[PDB]
Amino acid sequence: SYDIQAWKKQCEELLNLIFQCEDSEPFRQPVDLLEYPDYRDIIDTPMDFATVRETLEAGNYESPMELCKDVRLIFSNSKAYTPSKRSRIYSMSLRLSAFFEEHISSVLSDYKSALRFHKR
C-alpha cells in the first residue's frame, strides 16, 4: 500500500468522523476570549478542528505528522486550561483523543512505509 498521497483523504475522513462525535463540540472553532478572557495568558498557540481542516484543505500540511501535531495541541491546550481532571470539557477531550489516536495510527504507519518504499 505505497501511495505517498493517500494520507490526505484518510485525514479528511477522520476529521469528518470527529465532527460527528458529540465530544468534539467544544473544539470545533477557535476559543472565544469573551467567555475566557485570560485564554492567551495560558495558551500561546490556539488550535481547533476547523483550523486543522482548513489547513489540510489549503494544502498547507506536507505530512500527516504535521496534522497530528496540531490535533495533539488541541488536547494539550484543553489540559492546560482545565481547573480539574474532573471537568466536563477536559473529560470530552480525553475520549476524543483516544478515538483520534486509535484511527491516526495506521495513517501514520502507511505514510511512513510509503516514503521508505519510495527511497528504497
Ligand X SMILES: CCCCNC(=O)N1CCN(C(=O)c2ccco2)C[C@@H]1C
Residues that bind ligand X (CB under 6 A): 26-27, 31, 36, 48, 74, 77-78, 81, 89
Q: Who's near 48: CB < 8 A, 6+ residues apart?
A: 27, 28, 29, 30, 31, 74
Select 11 or 96, whichever has its Cβ closest to ligand X. 96
Select 89 or 98, whichever has its Cβ closest to ligand X. 89
Using an 8 Å Cβ cutoff, are 18 and 26 in contact?
no
Select 96 or 104, whichever has its Cβ closest to ligand X. 96
Residue 21 beta carbon to ligand X: minimum distance, rounded to whole angstroms = 14
Round to whole Å and give the CA distance between 62 and 5: 10
Residue 44 beta carbon to ligand X: minimum distance, rounded to whole angstroms = 12
Residue 27 beta carbon to ligand X: minimum distance, rounded to whole angstroms = 4
Round to whole Å and give the CA distance between 83 and 76: 14
